[PDB]
């Protein structure tokens, strides 16, 4: 039900989450240590586990209530740990082969995003990857209205319950998105040697930075 509702709310869920899993699987070994930042109920971690059965996953979030759903999702998994931490709290020591995030970093002020990308690179192995499945802003107000129409079109086409879309619109008041190319440049500023947008559906995009590749 929860997972079904995320697909109803998020355009191109399989393309965007799938692209995150694929780019990690082509960038790190089977036995990678992976941090999922703002893991929530652990959906991105779960997508990674399906492809990488031997990866060690650390799921981190500020919300014990969200992480309880992740604990249930990963009940029988001996290679998953859970950590309660804000993005602005001290990160785990690492090192990590990959740091991944979905629909979380857009909650931070822009300066805190720029600092976070830098802090993430410091806990990555050389050649390590940062991947974000993210809600992004259009480059202009007029395009932002078109992004909004395309998002609403997916939500309506998916037969999303009206109450859940209303609750979605209210949660989105707290969002601090920026355009995808600005955030990709922030990865270059943080010292990532390569950064790219792998996949995009208007308001939603999967992008990555490599720490030396
Ligand atoms: N500053 C912050 N530090 C840590 N987690 C944060 C945060 N701001 C928001 N979050 C978390 O970010 C998540 C956004 S919802 C996305 C959850 C999950 N990554 C998924 O793809 O389904 C929530 O679990 C919320 O608690
Ligand atoms: Ca949000």
Author numbering: 17 to 229
Question: Can you provide the manuscript's text about this entry?
Answer:
Here, we characterize the O-methyltransferases BelI and CysG, which catalyze the initial step of β-lactone formation. Employing techniques such as crystallography, computational analysis, mutagenesis, and activity assays, we identified a His-His-Asp (HHD) motif in the active sites of the two enzymes, which is crucial for binding a catalytically active calcium ion. As expected, BelI as well as CysGΔN16 adopt the class I methyltransferase Rossmann fold, characterized by a core domain of a seven-stranded β-sheet flanked by α-helices. The HHD-motif enables regiospecific C1-carboxy group methylation of their respective malic substrates.
